[PDB]
Amino acid sequence: NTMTTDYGTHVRQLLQQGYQISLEYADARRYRTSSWQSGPTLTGQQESQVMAAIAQLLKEHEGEYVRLIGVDPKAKRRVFEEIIQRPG
């Protein structure tokens, strides 16, 4: 298994507040140097669709790190970041 946080609450809050969701990932080498690799920008606004997408993603990145990102669409700056999965 992997170490995860209870990220559904943040997904829901980001969607409800109108922030754009994206993610990024890193293996141990890239985590050690903060060189995250780009993941998807999730266009759905349906909480169930976003959560299903993130679950597939976390399964693909088992053994790696994954960071959930919220962005202000207007300012294009990050309003939220959390490492939602780490190696277990």
Sites for Cl ion among residues 10-39 (CB under 5 A): none
Cβ closest to Cl ion, residue 37 vs residue 43 = 43
Could you tell me the smallest distance in angstroms from the CB atom of residue 48 to Cl ion?
A: 9
Q: Which stretch binds Cl ion (CB under 5 A): 3-11, 26-34, 41-49, 70-78?
A: 41-49
Cβ closest to Cl ion, residue 34 vs residue 48 = 48
Rounded Cα distance, 69 and 84, in Å:
10
Can you spell out the DSSP letters for 7-43? THHHHHHHHHHTPEEEEEEE-HHHHHTT-PEEEEEE-
